[PDB]
Design a protein around this ligand. Structure first.
Ligand SMILES: *C(=O)[C@H](C)C(=O)[C@H](C)[C@@H](O)[C@@H](C)C[C@@H](C)C(=O)CC[C@@H](C)[C@H](O)CC
Ligand SMILES: *C(=O)[C@H](C)C(=O)[C@H](C)[C@@H](O)[C@@H](C)C[C@@H](C)C(=O)CC[C@@H](C)[C@H](O)CC
Lengths: 277, 277
């Protein structure tokens, strides 16, 4: 395919993943942007992947698609089949990755706003619980804070699947070789350069300083296996959130917890969603 | 073409030529390299573009290909024809702009040594005179110093057509916009991204500290007309070299001196080559 993918592949071989996300981020600024929510090119309509039972005031899960360039609609397919007959599971797309190619959000809040406007429409009046894995975790918490403040529609709760927020990213950096290798592994097609740029831009948004904590109760799903090597001498490699309302450990590592062991993740979510209603 | 050419074109409209030329250099670190002169992918065999008289002590012109990604072999055609029946004129390619796609020099000295080898092997016993325009004048001098210091075989002279060496590029900044637009306006087809990466890598090299100065006599050929506006009380917009053997001015600006008035340039070089013989 494109040259940005050839550079990306070379940077993973050569254990320079970190360096190269900076080039992706810096190059993304010369893509076309959209500056206001309605100026988004993609129809951000959510997509129903599971239905709940025909009852009544229960909450719907909203999956927030992650930053991975090789991500798309299929991200939540394995996970969602375990919410069938349990909860509505809608997956919202992320602005910057669709069909030509798409306008990049000028800044993070513009994209979160465009997302919240589409979730509110499709949610109706159901209470809404947000869900993200990895970079999607960070994203979901920001959308939860952006729904609370900017739109006065605070979510019923947030599920964070293995988040490494800016305080606690040391195990993510150490393992960045595997993270990069995992992106390539999990490829249905050659990653487009348009999406690699999109990925780099959101990587920059989320790396940055971010102020508010969202008042919604947080469920923190952590992996059990480390992604790579890690001397016990060096501390806890597990994902971290500050005052989890509930902590749940599922089998596998940063990657396999949503592939092989996604039913354990849905089991934690179901148990938790009832304990809060 | 590809994504880099799109990003670059966006950047020129937004007077951000400078910042994007630094994305290109950063990005180019992740291309495959060659670290010794032998490991060069291309055959750097020079090319005969003008034949001299059949008369020996007689010096040959060697043209050093510039850094512009929009060029290659056609660069010296208008100039070389005025050397027919006057001087032999070789044109030596720059490593990194070949066929698939070509390996990049680990550093500038690895490229010059690759080129100095193909030039000694072709000059045979003749004195060589290196000739370069814009970025290629910075490359001509750097090669002359390499042929001297490292190969023990200094050239007979250097023809620097309009250099703006590191401490005197204020005109190059003020005119960044015109420069980037002329880069596109000279496309005879889309600029490949591997070549755009090539340009940014060499541009980085040439901004470096290259303290070695050559001992060959230097003909500084200057444009007569400024490329864009310039407030005369800023200093001199003209091209600059320290202590040149000869200064010759020619009609046109930084671009047009080499297209429209390549006859003027060639006559300056022929008069001077005689004076030093
Ligand atoms: C999760 O996606 C990664 C490990 C993550 O949370 C880091 C710390 C964030 O900065 C994101 C924005 C990193 C980017 C580069 C990313 O998209 C990583 C994607 C990989 C690691 C996914 O696990 C693939 C399913
Ligand atoms: C000459 O090539 C340019 C104006 C130049 O010398 C600048 C000051 C150097 O930094 C070079 C290495 C800059 C690169 C980007 C370059 O080759 C630009 C080339 C265009 C604008 C040429 O004028 C076309 C031959």
């Amino acid at each position: 395919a494109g040259m940005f993918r050839a550079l990306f592949r070379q940077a993973v071989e050569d254990d320079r993943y970190g360096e190269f996300l900076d080039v992706l981020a810096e190059a993304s600024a010369f893509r076309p942007q959209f500056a206001s929510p309605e100026a988004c090119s993609e129809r951000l309509d959510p997509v129903l992947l599971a239905g709940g039972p025909t009852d009544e005031g229960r909450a719907v899960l909203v999956g927030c698609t992650g930053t991975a360039a090789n991500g798309g609609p299929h991200e939540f397919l394995r996970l969602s089949t375990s919410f069938q007959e349990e909860r509505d599971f809608l997956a919202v797309p992320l602005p910057g990755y669709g069909t030509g190619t798409a306008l990049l959000p000028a800044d993070l809040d513009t994209a979160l706003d465009a997302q919240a406007r589409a979730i509110l429409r499709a949610a109706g009046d159901a209470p809404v619980v947000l869900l993200g894995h990895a970079g999607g975790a960070l994203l979901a918490h920001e959308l939860a804070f952006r729904l609370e403040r900017a739109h006065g529609a605070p979510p019923a709760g947030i599920v964070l699947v293995d988040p490494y927020p800016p305080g606690h990213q040391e195990p993510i950096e150490v393992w960045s070789r595997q993270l990069g290798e995992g992106l390539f592994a999990g490829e249905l097609e050659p990653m487009s350069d348009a999406r690699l740029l999109a990925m780099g831009r959101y990587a920059r948004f989320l790396a940055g300083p971010r102020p508010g904590r969202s008042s919604a109760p947080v469920l923190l799903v952590r992996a059990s296996e480390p992604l790579g090597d890690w001397q016990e001498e060096r501390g806890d490699w597990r994902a971290h959130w500050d005052l989890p309302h509930t902590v749940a450990d599922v089998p596998g590592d940063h990657f396999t917890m949503m592939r092989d062991h996604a039913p354990a993740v849905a089991e934690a979510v179901l148990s938790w969603l009832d304990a809060i209603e």
